[PDB]
Write an enzyme that holds these catalytic residues in place. Structure first.
Site, PDB file in Angstrom:
ATOM      1  N   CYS B 114     118.904 152.170   8.674  1.00  0.00           N
ATOM      2  CA  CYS B 114     118.582 151.918  10.182  1.00  0.00           C
ATOM      3  C   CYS B 114     116.891 152.439  10.217  1.00  0.00           C
ATOM      4  O   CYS B 114     116.763 153.725   9.925  1.00  0.00           O
ATOM      5  CB  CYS B 114     119.245 152.899  10.982  1.00  0.00           C
ATOM      6  SG  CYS B 114     118.561 152.989  12.616  1.00  0.00           S
ATOM      7  N   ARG B 117     115.557 155.384  13.723  1.00  0.00           N
ATOM      8  CA  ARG B 117     116.246 156.494  13.646  1.00  0.00           C
ATOM      9  C   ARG B 117     115.123 157.494  14.071  1.00  0.00           C
ATOM     10  O   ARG B 117     115.347 158.747  14.495  1.00  0.00           O
ATOM     11  CB  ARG B 117     116.438 156.950  12.219  1.00  0.00           C
ATOM     12  CG  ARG B 117     117.875 156.596  11.835  1.00  0.00           C
ATOM     13  CD  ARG B 117     118.118 157.235  10.302  1.00  0.00           C
ATOM     14  NE  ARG B 117     117.522 156.441   9.401  1.00  0.00           N
ATOM     15  CZ  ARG B 117     117.393 156.889   8.303  1.00  0.00           C
ATOM     16  NH1 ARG B 117     117.888 157.938   7.865  1.00  0.00           N
ATOM     17  NH2 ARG B 117     116.830 156.009   7.115  1.00  0.00           N
ATOM     18  N   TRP B 286     118.008 148.639  20.514  1.00  0.00           N
ATOM     19  CA  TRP B 286     117.360 147.400  20.978  1.00  0.00           C
ATOM     20  C   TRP B 286     116.826 146.850  19.872  1.00  0.00           C
ATOM     21  O   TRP B 286     116.672 147.238  18.803  1.00  0.00           O
ATOM     22  CB  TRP B 286     116.109 147.784  21.933  1.00  0.00           C
ATOM     23  CG  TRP B 286     115.199 148.739  21.261  1.00  0.00           C
ATOM     24  CD1 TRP B 286     114.277 148.818  20.450  1.00  0.00           C
ATOM     25  CD2 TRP B 286     114.923 150.038  21.509  1.00  0.00           C
ATOM     26  NE1 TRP B 286     113.628 149.708  20.299  1.00  0.00           N
ATOM     27  CE2 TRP B 286     114.035 150.576  20.782  1.00  0.00           C
ATOM     28  CE3 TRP B 286     115.725 150.998  22.866  1.00  0.00           C
ATOM     29  CZ2 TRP B 286     113.581 152.080  21.149  1.00  0.00           C
ATOM     30  CZ3 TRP B 286     115.345 152.487  22.941  1.00  0.00           C
ATOM     31  CH2 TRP B 286     114.376 152.929  22.228  1.00  0.00           C
ATOM     32  N   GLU B 291     114.647 140.484  13.164  1.00  0.00           N
ATOM     33  CA  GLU B 291     115.924 140.275  13.173  1.00  0.00           C
ATOM     34  C   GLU B 291     116.135 139.046  13.578  1.00  0.00           C
ATOM     35  O   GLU B 291     116.887 138.107  12.950  1.00  0.00           O
ATOM     36  CB  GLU B 291     116.747 141.378  13.952  1.00  0.00           C
ATOM     37  CG  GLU B 291     116.500 142.853  13.379  1.00  0.00           C
ATOM     38  CD  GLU B 291     117.317 143.840  14.238  1.00  0.00           C
ATOM     39  OE1 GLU B 291     118.594 143.928  14.106  1.00  0.00           O
ATOM     40  OE2 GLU B 291     116.848 144.391  15.259  1.00  0.00           O
TER      41      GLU B 291
HETATM   42  C1  HEM Z   1     116.914 152.357  19.298  1.00  0.00           C
HETATM   43  C2  HEM Z   1     116.624 151.170  18.399  1.00  0.00           C
HETATM   44  C3  HEM Z   1     117.059 150.938  17.433  1.00  0.00           C
HETATM   45  C4  HEM Z   1     116.373 150.084  16.273  1.00  0.00           C
HETATM   46  C5  HEM Z   1     115.022 149.320  16.451  1.00  0.00           C
HETATM   47  C6  HEM Z   1     117.245 149.670  15.184  1.00  0.00           C
HETATM   48  C7  HEM Z   1     116.990 148.842  14.239  1.00  0.00           C
HETATM   49  C8  HEM Z   1     117.819 148.458  13.156  1.00  0.00           C
HETATM   50  C9  HEM Z   1     117.621 147.323  12.256  1.00  0.00           C
HETATM   51  C10 HEM Z   1     116.494 146.422  12.242  1.00  0.00           C
HETATM   52  C11 HEM Z   1     118.562 147.333  11.514  1.00  0.00           C
HETATM   53  C12 HEM Z   1     118.679 146.323  10.467  1.00  0.00           C
HETATM   54  C13 HEM Z   1     120.040 145.355  10.554  1.00  0.00           C
HETATM   55  C14 HEM Z   1     120.235 144.300   9.898  1.00  0.00           C
HETATM   56  O1  HEM Z   1     119.581 143.872   8.906  1.00  0.00           O
HETATM   57  O2  HEM Z   1     121.467 143.741   9.638  1.00  0.00           O
HETATM   58  C15 HEM Z   1     119.547 148.390  11.702  1.00  0.00           C
HETATM   59  C16 HEM Z   1     120.611 148.896  11.100  1.00  0.00           C
HETATM   60  C17 HEM Z   1     121.474 149.969  11.498  1.00  0.00           C
HETATM   61  N1  HEM Z   1     121.321 150.698  12.486  1.00  0.00           N
HETATM   62 FE1  HEM Z   1     119.726 150.836  13.817  1.00  0.00          FE
HETATM   63  N2  HEM Z   1     118.416 150.653  15.383  1.00  0.00           N
HETATM   64  C18 HEM Z   1     118.224 151.143  16.566  1.00  0.00           C
HETATM   65  C19 HEM Z   1     119.221 151.947  16.772  1.00  0.00           C
HETATM   66  C20 HEM Z   1     120.285 152.196  16.545  1.00  0.00           C
HETATM   67  C21 HEM Z   1     121.331 153.103  16.932  1.00  0.00           C
HETATM   68  C22 HEM Z   1     121.496 153.663  18.242  1.00  0.00           C
HETATM   69  C23 HEM Z   1     122.622 153.444  15.947  1.00  0.00           C
HETATM   70  C24 HEM Z   1     123.753 154.210  15.966  1.00  0.00           C
HETATM   71  C25 HEM Z   1     124.302 154.763  16.977  1.00  0.00           C
HETATM   72  C26 HEM Z   1     121.884 152.759  14.795  1.00  0.00           C
HETATM   73  C27 HEM Z   1     122.884 152.612  13.574  1.00  0.00           C
HETATM   74  C28 HEM Z   1     122.380 151.685  12.621  1.00  0.00           C
HETATM   75  C29 HEM Z   1     123.314 151.485  11.472  1.00  0.00           C
HETATM   76  C30 HEM Z   1     124.387 152.245  10.939  1.00  0.00           C
HETATM   77  C31 HEM Z   1     122.803 150.331  10.691  1.00  0.00           C
HETATM   78  C32 HEM Z   1     123.300 149.731   9.493  1.00  0.00           C
HETATM   79  C33 HEM Z   1     124.014 148.300   9.692  1.00  0.00           C
HETATM   80  C34 HEM Z   1     124.590 147.854   8.681  1.00  0.00           C
HETATM   81  O3  HEM Z   1     124.821 148.226   7.636  1.00  0.00           O
HETATM   82  O4  HEM Z   1     125.040 146.382   8.759  1.00  0.00           O
HETATM   83  N3  HEM Z   1     120.886 152.278  15.087  1.00  0.00           N
HETATM   84  N4  HEM Z   1     119.120 149.174  12.706  1.00  0.00           N
HETATM   85  C1  LIG Z   2     122.200 149.196  16.445  1.00  0.00           C
HETATM   86  C2  LIG Z   2     121.568 148.188  15.954  1.00  0.00           C
HETATM   87  C3  LIG Z   2     120.071 147.906  16.437  1.00  0.00           C
HETATM   88  C4  LIG Z   2     119.260 146.710  15.927  1.00  0.00           C
HETATM   89  N1  LIG Z   2     118.167 146.567  16.436  1.00  0.00           N
HETATM   90  N2  LIG Z   2     119.914 145.835  15.025  1.00  0.00           N
HETATM   91  C5  LIG Z   2     121.422 145.975  14.560  1.00  0.00           C
HETATM   92  C6  LIG Z   2     122.121 144.858  13.734  1.00  0.00           C
HETATM   93  C7  LIG Z   2     123.437 144.672  13.873  1.00  0.00           C
HETATM   94  N3  LIG Z   2     123.655 143.486  13.314  1.00  0.00           N
HETATM   95  C8  LIG Z   2     123.618 142.370  13.488  1.00  0.00           C
HETATM   96  O1  LIG Z   2     122.905 142.047  14.477  1.00  0.00           O
HETATM   97  C9  LIG Z   2     123.884 140.927  12.640  1.00  0.00           C
HETATM   98  C10 LIG Z   2     124.173 141.249  11.052  1.00  0.00           C
HETATM   99  C11 LIG Z   2     124.351 140.003  10.447  1.00  0.00           C
HETATM  100  C12 LIG Z   2     124.424 138.830  10.905  1.00  0.00           C
HETATM  101  C13 LIG Z   2     124.517 137.797   9.990  1.00  0.00           C
HETATM  102  N4  LIG Z   2     124.974 136.816   9.190  1.00  0.00           N
HETATM  103  C14 LIG Z   2     124.105 138.701  12.164  1.00  0.00           C
HETATM  104  C15 LIG Z   2     123.746 139.664  13.015  1.00  0.00           C
HETATM  105  C16 LIG Z   2     122.072 147.147  14.930  1.00  0.00           C
END
Ligand code: HEM
Ligand SMILES: Cc1cc(N)nc(CCNC(=O)c2ccc(C#N)cc2)c1
Ligand code: HEM
Ligand SMILES: Cc1cc(N)nc(CCNC(=O)c2ccc(C#N)cc2)c1
Ligand SMILES: CCCCCCCCO[C@@H]1O[C@H](CO)[C@@H](O)[C@H](O)[C@H]1O
Ligand SMILES: CCCCCCCCO[C@@H]1O[C@H](CO)[C@@H](O)[C@H](O)[C@H]1O
Ligand SMILES: C[C@H](O)[C@H](O)[C@@H]1CNc2nc(N)[nH]c(=O)c2N1
Ligand SMILES: C[C@H](O)[C@H](O)[C@@H]1CNc2nc(N)[nH]c(=O)c2N1
Lengths: 415, 415
Positions: B114, B117, B286, B291
């Site tokens: 993430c 963070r 958000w 993405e």
């Molecule tokens: C507040 C704005 C936030 C932004 C901009 C952000 C952005 C991102 C982005 C760009 C990814 C990549 C997702 C992907 O490529 O599939 C991600 C993954 C992730 N985020 Fe954040 N996030 C935010 C908030 C949060 C919150 C509030 C949580 C948990 C309470 C969180 C938990 C995670 C986790 C666990 C992943 C891993 C997802 C996976 O492994 O498929 N995020 N986030």
């Molecule tokens: C908390 C959070 C914040 C943020 N900014 N983006 C995410 C990503 C969640 N995952 C997806 O949106 C997604 C993952 C894989 C595919 C595919 N294929 C499509 C969507 C989570």
């Protein structure tokens, strides 16, 4: 006690202690590290204990002989016999030129961080194992530079110098790459040229070399033959082909007064093969546009030309979200490809380079059920997921033969 | 016998056997893998053996109490006393709402993949541990979607459902994310909508849901409460905020008829904390422009709009080296940011997101000497080295609390 972490842009260092609180052994992955001891092959004081050398030696020879379409068992056995004897009798051994050629291509084939491996079988090998003086190294390097450059029609090649014997007589090129620009700390505090070669430009000054305080001064060859101190050798300018940078549309681009050398050649790596290790074996391929366009020209700690190009393009270089940086870097990449093409100097864009590697990787699996690959290095510095290698899972392991990093020679060599 | 490797674009699989020939244990790095067993927390049949639960429990409570500026030793000891008892007496336990809140933020804080963070301390926690029926889950999810959307001014939140007890009564959202478009295999062989949700759109059809065969049909909620089969629930359209895509300069962009939902929310992960594990805890933040602009719109296996935009821009979409793909993807990214901004829906470009993470990472090291980070996930899918995180070495380890992946529920749940 703690892991050391570095930022190759700011140079800043961090110590990681938190990882001690990590959970049950999972898949602390040290994959984001530039130079892990795992990829380094340091100095020595004594020959390779025969107990270890013979095993590897046999191993390599079996690999070498196993590489033929129609085996030569007769020769194979004989060769194993002969090599053992040579080790019992001399405590080491010599590879047939063919084995050396085979080792270099295989080592290349096993470079997980190299995206140009579909070219692995195509390599020119210069045998300089007989070299004995720095001056001879210099002449050998020049032949290499001349051959490889081939007037713009770049050719891949490697020059193998004498294999490490006792460890106190290693041939070592002190430079990181054959051709590289100097970096100066100007009197007015500013830095001119390649900010990344500041220290090495100093070591060169210190060894006599006369600084030209230019933006693009090709550094000299700093060579250590046998085990003796390094002798400084300036590269004959006629041997260094360069490309002046210009844009297919922005006429002001040339006003930037940019250019770059055409030959990408690694000078500081060690070739490990069947137990033997060559601490001096410079090799080269041809450029991938993004190396120059993105890393060399746009890295903060290098020529850092992004903001200048941004303004020229009239972009909102003050509003990050405008994504002006994405527009600028792309135009620069266009300039690089355009210029190399225009001046007929071999170069490959990152998109076709990536498809190239995918094809190679697939060939590798059929061929031998694998392809050691480092995703972090293989994925281009721009437009990552637009590239097919980005969506590919990869296994990164160290096979053999292999090209290891080494400890910077000015850190262990004693004068 | 061999490692299984996958290409998330082509879907193709490879078996790696060559790694068996790897050299002495170095730094086979399985870092390029999407779902390593290391990051997964599967099913169960019996409660967490008390021998293991108590240790973790004590551990967590010590962490929780150690998190105060001015300790509450009195309360701390008492709490440890109380929890032990609750486990001896019930074989498990309950976290005070504050502990839960603390666990969710810490788990987020420990998400190596993430990039957002720096926002970790800012999270809204909805306590639904008392839920008991699917319908109640549905109502809870809706409250969440409504709250988080906040009319475009996005808010991060998580809804914690009942913690796993015996393992045969888990609350599980079958969807990957709260909001996601359906994918259909049209009669004329073509695929409409999100090619990535083809199978899940089917599972939805199979459970009753009526397909609308649209390009942007929001899939239904497939919820399994307690341990019972999953009930299908269509999301109230009024609750799904969307952004219609338009370019700040290309008027033809809207002609593409594109749009995307504003809420990125993970629905299928498990929250492990002090021994307890919640198999149902959807959370959201958000969007980061890339993405949608890069992955959702330009991945081959998703909406794959690159070539269409290339032509519209009048680029040489037939000459890879023209770098038309780099020009197109950037314009698309511009459309996404521009549209979200125009319609006042929170979003952050990847450049400022990356600086954001750098600041966070530095705060983390001072604060606690570390920050588990996955370089492969943190580096944006475009303009990698233009970003500061690209030049940063990172350590990726699994701490606790933590958000693990789980085995797709339709693979282990029995009807
Ligand atoms: C507040 C704005 C936030 C932004 C901009 C952000 C952005 C991102 C982005 C760009 C990814 C990549 C997702 C992907 O490529 O599939 C991600 C993954 C992730 N985020 Fe954040 N996030 C935010 C908030 C949060 C919150 C509030 C949580 C948990 C309470 C969180 C938990 C995670 C986790 C666990 C992943 C891993 C997802 C996976 O492994 O498929 N995020 N986030
Ligand atoms: C908390 C959070 C914040 C943020 N900014 N983006 C995410 C990503 C969640 N995952 C997806 O949106 C997604 C993952 C894989 C595919 C595919 N294929 C499509 C969507 C989570
Ligand atoms: C023929 C064209 C070739 C191309 C396009 C190519 C391209 C590349 C690129 C893009 C890198 C990244 C360098 C960096 O980011 O610093 C690289 C690394 C590397 N290449 Fe290739 N290469 C080619 C030929 C060769 C040859 C002929 C050899 C060896 C005989 C080789 C060995 C390596 C090694 C070992 C690395 C790792 C460098 C390091 O770790 O610093 N390459 N190559
Ligand atoms: C065989 C080869 C082919 C190819 N296409 N590119 C390379 C890369 C060699 N390394 C460098 O050029 C280099 C590495 C780091 C910095 C810095 N800072 C500057 C240059 C090798
Ligand atoms: C202790 C050293 C034992 C060496 C045993 C070598 C046995 C011969 O090895 C054979 O070599 C051929 C090529 O020549 C290959 O094609 C065969 O696959 C391989 O089994
Ligand atoms: C087997 C269980 C042993 C539990 C011993 C707990 C000792 C109290 O632990 C203390 O808690 C404080 C917060 O309340 C922290 O600030 C202190 O650093 C910590 O040492
Ligand atoms: C820290 C990080 O590993 C490093 O800055 C990167 C990553 N990937 C790379 N990939 C290539 N090809 N070349 C590089 O120099 C790097 N360096
Ligand atoms: C195979 C490779 O790990 C995978 O396709 C990538 C890499 N990095 C990523 N990074 C993010 N943020 N999201 C992703 O889906 C991926 N997937």
């Amino acid at each position: 006690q703690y892991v050391r972490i570095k930022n190759w842009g700011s140079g800043e260092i961090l110590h990681d202690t938190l990882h001690h609180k990590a959970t049950s052994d999972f898949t602390s992955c040290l994959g984001s590290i530039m130079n892990p001891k795992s990829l380094t092959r340091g100095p020595r004081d004594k020959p390779t204990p025969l107990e270890e050398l013979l095993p590897h030696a046999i191993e390599f020879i079996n690999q070498y002989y196993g590489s033929f379409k129609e085996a030569k068992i007769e020769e194979h056995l004989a060769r194993l016999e002969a090599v053992t004897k040579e080790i019992e009798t001399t405590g080491t051994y010599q590879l047939t030129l063919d084995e050396l050629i085979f080792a270099t291509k295989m080592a290349w084939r096993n470079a997980p961080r190299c995206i140009g491996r579909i070219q692995w079988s195509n390599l020119q090998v210069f045998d300089a194992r007989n070299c004995s003086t720095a001056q001879e190294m210099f002449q050998h390097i020049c032949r290499h530079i001349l051959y490889a450059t081939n007037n713009g029609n770049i050719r891949s090649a490697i020059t193998v110098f004498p294999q490490r014997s006792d460890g106190k007589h290693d041939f070592r090129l002190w430079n990181s790459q054959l051709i590289r620009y100097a970096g100066y700390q100007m009197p007015d505090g500013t830095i001119r040229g390649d900010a990344a070669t500041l220290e090495f430009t100093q070591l060169c000054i210190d060894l006599g070399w006369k600084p030209r305080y230019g933006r693009f001064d090709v550094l000299p060859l700093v060579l250590q033959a046998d085990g003796q101190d390094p002798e400084v050798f300036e590269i004959p300018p006629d041997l260094v082909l360069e490309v002046t940078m210009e844009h297919p549309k922005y006429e002001w681009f040339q006003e930037l007064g940019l250019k770059w050398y055409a030959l990408p050649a690694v000078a500081n790596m060690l070739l490990e093969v069947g137990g033997l290790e060559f601490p001096a074996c410079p090799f080269n391929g041809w450029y991938m546009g993004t190396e120059i366009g993105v890393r060399d020209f746009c890295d903060t700690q290098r020529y850092n030309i992004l903001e200048e190009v941004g303004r020229r393009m009239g972009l909102e270089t003050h509003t990050l979200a405008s994504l002006w940086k994405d527009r600028a870097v792309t135009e620069i990449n266009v300039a690089v490809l355009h210029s190399f093409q225009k001046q007929n100097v071999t170069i490959m864009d990152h998109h076709t380079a990536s498809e190239s590697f995918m094809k190679h990787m697939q060939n590798e699996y059929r061929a031998r059920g694998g392809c050691p690959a480092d995703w972090i290095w293989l994925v281009p510095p721009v437009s990552g997921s637009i590239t097919p290698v980005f969506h590919q899972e990869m296994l990164n392991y160290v096979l053999s033969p292999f090209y290891y990093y080494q400890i910077e020679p000015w850190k262990t060599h004693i004068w």
